[PDB]
């Protein structure tokens, strides 16, 4: 029998209006071998912090690691001062407090470290948690809502381990070029778990929490997934798909049918990204087993979910151009190291100082020099180009949920046309329509970056003020 799917605790404020998060080192077991891991309020991963539109909460963050860290709320429209980018340092043994004044629609967001040059390692060690934002609108819908029963978070991540069982993380020329990736897949920290779901509808809140691996969800028997929400909240209507690509840092909420007595798997299908279709990910790979059970459920798939506003008019919008680049030497040397490791048949396309080698507008990230000041309270058009580069860059902008106008050469797919905080850039150009409602000064700037973490950590990031 498979281990049961772990369910993160749904964490709400105490009588002081406070939530306590302790960042700490402990131990986990994978494949019978123990490993040192890091977690929020535990050994690995983290709880699901529950927030309500229009209400404030205060979060007390205790760093019990022996190195500096920061805590970023990915997807939250909050001021730079509480955004927890690389300037939001928490000393070892210290505590920092932030007040979050939640003012955006219902969504599944998440949180993770953003330490300067070390974001990849700190996420690889185990640090990530969830954010469940609710509002009046969503609770009136007849969606599955029993946490841990028919409304289930699914945080999917790969790791690699050394022979002794420890997490094997390195920022080297190979991983700086293609990313940190591994041969072991985790689902809420467990290897191929099973979840017991009531007959009817099952709601999955999917997060790609990998450092560098893109994913593509589907089911083992080809039943459809009904997408109801993206990074920034509900779609206007459900969107039926047979497969669902999810980039690093993205979330989607789906409904799937659960019937009778026969179990089926959620799987991830092979992707085209360099390194990622190497065995065991050259075939459909199980994520988790879904076992039907005969207990109470009343969730439904509504005809209509939300209202989606018109895209803003393009006339007179400020245009900002962001050119992504990688040093051609890093591309050469990294790809060479990949073929040296795995050989020339490992996947398709293989047989025919790196610390500041990745850049935006010809500059590796400078924490002391924000690239520009964006306007407050008005839409801008940002144009992000990966032309001249063949790698995949899921481009993430802090402090906002935006609308995708063009994604890598075409209008976005229907389930990607709502509220997003990430856009695909892969050898072509993308355009987003973006608005910042909150301030970010030089001392606590917003970041914009590729969310392939090893690219971020080796320079593919800029700061901006509002
Ligand atoms: Cu993030
Ligand atoms: Cu973010
Ligand atoms: Cu990148
Ligand atoms: Cu970031």
Give domain status of residue 302, yes or no: no
User: d(Cα 249, Cα 156) in Å, to the nearest integer?
Assistant: 10
Residue 44: give the domain boundaries. 1-145
| Residue 102: both structure tokens together | 């939640």
439: CATH: 2.60.40.420
Number of domains observed in the structure of the chain: 3
How many angstroms is it from 302 CA to the middle of ligand 4? 33
How many angstroms is it from 422 CA to the middle of ligand 2? 9
139 and 83 together in one domain: yes
Q: Which of 382, 404, 400 is nearest to 440 (CA)?
A: 400
Say what the resolution is, in angstroms: 1.5
368 and 395 together in one domain: yes
How many angstroms is it from 261 CA to the middle of ligand 1? 38
User: d(Cα 405, Cα 119) in Å, to the nearest integer?
Assistant: 29
Torsion of CA 407, 412, 418, 419, to 10 degrees: -20
| Residue 349: both structure tokens together | 């396309």
Q: Is 396 annotated as a binding residue?
A: yes
| Residue 84: both structure tokens together | 């927890």
How many angstroms is it from 185 CA to the middle of ligand 3? 22
How many angstroms is it from 249 CA to the middle of ligand 1? 5
Cα angle: 251, vertex 257, 261; to 5 degrees: 130
Q: Is 352 annotated as a binding residue?
A: no
Q: Is 74 annotated as a binding residue?
A: yes
466 and 332 together in one domain: yes
141 and 213 together in one domain: no
* Contact between residue 50 and residue 68 where contact means Cβ atoms under 8 Å apart: no
Q: Is 415 annotated as a binding residue?
A: no
118 and 150 together in one domain: no
How many angstroms is it from 75 CA to the middle of ligand 2? 6
How many angstroms is it from 213 CA to the middle of ligand 1? 14
Please identify, among 246, 268, 297, the residue that sits at the C-terminal boundary of a domain.
297
CB neighbours of 330 closer than 8 A, spacing ≥ 6? 173, 176, 177, 354, 357, 358, 458
Approach to solving: X-ray
* Contact between residue 325 and residue 358 where contact means Cβ atoms under 8 Å apart: yes
95 and 221 together in one domain: no
* Contact between residue 319 and residue 380 where contact means Cβ atoms under 8 Å apart: yes
CB neighbours of 315 closer than 8 A, spacing ≥ 6? none
Cα angle: 132, vertex 135, 137; to 5 degrees: 125
Please identify, among 114, 145, 176, the residue that sits at the C-terminal boundary of a domain.
145
270 and 413 together in one domain: no
Q: Could you identify the residue written with the tokens 């591994």?
A: 182
370 and 240 together in one domain: no
60: burial class by Cβ within 10 Å (0-12, 13-18, 19+)?
Answer: middle
Listed as own residue / partner, the contacts of 442-446 with beta carbons closer than 8 Å and 24 or more positions apart are 442/370, 443/87, 444/79, 444/80, 444/81, 444/83, 444/85, 444/87, 444/88, 445/80, 445/85, 445/87, 445/370, 446/80, 446/83, 446/85, 446/374, 446/397, 446/398, 446/399
**How far from each other are the two terminal CA atoms of the chain, in whole angstroms?**
53
How many angstroms is it from 398 CA to the middle of ligand 4? 6
* Contact between residue 119 and residue 249 where contact means Cβ atoms under 8 Å apart: no
Residue 13: how many CB atoms within 10 A of its CB?
A: 17
User: d(Cα 311, Cα 289) in Å, to the nearest integer?
Assistant: 39
Q: Is 285 annotated as a binding residue?
A: no
160 and 58 together in one domain: no
Q: Is 438 annotated as a binding residue?
A: no
Please identify, among 111, 126, 145, the residue that sits at the C-terminal boundary of a domain.
145
User: d(Cα 249, Cα 7) in Å, to the nearest integer?
Assistant: 19
| Residue 66: both structure tokens together | 């022996």
343: burial class by Cβ within 10 Å (0-12, 13-18, 19+)?
Answer: exposed
107 and 63 together in one domain: yes
């Amino acid at each position: 029998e498979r281990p049961t799917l772990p369910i993160p605790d749904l964490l709400t404020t105490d009588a002081r209006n406070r939530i306590q998060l302790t960042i700490g080192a402990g131990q986990s077991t994978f494949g019978g071998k123990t490993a040192t891991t890091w977690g929020y309020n535990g050994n690995l991963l983290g709880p699901a912090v529950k927030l309500q539109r229009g209400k404030a909460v205060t979060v007390d963050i205790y760093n019990q690691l022996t190195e500096e860290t920061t805590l970023h709320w990915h997807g939250l429209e909050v001021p730079g001062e509480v955004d927890g980018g690389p300037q939001g340092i928490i000393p070892p043994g210290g505590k920092r407090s932030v007040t979050l004044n939640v003012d955006q629609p219902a969504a599944t967001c998440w949180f993770h470290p953003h330490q300067h040059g070390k974001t990849g390692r700190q996420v690889a060690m185990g640090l990530a948690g969830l954010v469940v934002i609710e509002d009046d609108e969503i609770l009136k819908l007849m969606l599955p809502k029993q946490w841990g029963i028919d409304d289930v978070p699914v945080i999917v991540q790969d790791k690699k381990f050394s022979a002794d069982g420890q997490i094997d993380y390195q920022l080297d020329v190979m991983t700086a070029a293609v990313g940190w990736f591994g041969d072991t897949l985790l689902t809420n920290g467990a290897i191929y778990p099973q979840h017991a779901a009531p007959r009817g509808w099952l709601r999955l809140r999917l997060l790609n929490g990998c450092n560098a691996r893109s994913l593509n969800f589907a089911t083992s028997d080809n039943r459809p997934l009904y997408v109801i929400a993206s990074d920034g909240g509900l779609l206007p209507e459900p969107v039926k798909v047979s497969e669902l690509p999810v980039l690093m840092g993205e979330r989607f909420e789906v409904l799937v049918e659960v019937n009778d007595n026969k179990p089926f798997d959620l799987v991830t299908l092979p992707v085209s990204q360099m390194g990622m279709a190497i065995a065991p990910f050259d075939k459909p790979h199980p994520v988790m087993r879904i076992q039907p059970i005969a207990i109470s459920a009343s969730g439904a798939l509504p005809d209509t979910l939300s209202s989606l506003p018109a895209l803003p008019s393009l006339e007179g919008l400020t245009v900002r151009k962001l050119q992504l680049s990688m040093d051609p030497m890093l591309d050469m040397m990294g790809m060479q190291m990949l073929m040296e490791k795995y050989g020339d048949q490992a996947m398709a396309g293989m047989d025919h100082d790196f610390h500041h080698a990745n850049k935006i507008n010809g500059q590796a990230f400078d924490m002391n020099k924000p690239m520009f000041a964006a306007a407050k309270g008005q839409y801008e058009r940002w144009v992000i180009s990966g032309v001249g580069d063949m790698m995949l860059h899921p481009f993430h902008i802090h402090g906002t949920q935006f609308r995708i106008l063009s994604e890598n050469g075409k209008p976005p797919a229907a389930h990607r046309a709502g509220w997003k905080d990430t856009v695909k850039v892969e050898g072509n150009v993308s355009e987003v329509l973006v608005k910042f409602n909150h301030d970010a000064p030089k001392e606590h700037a917003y970041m914009a970056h590729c969310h392939l973490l090893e690219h971020e950590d080796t320079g593919m990031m800029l700061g901006f003020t509002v």
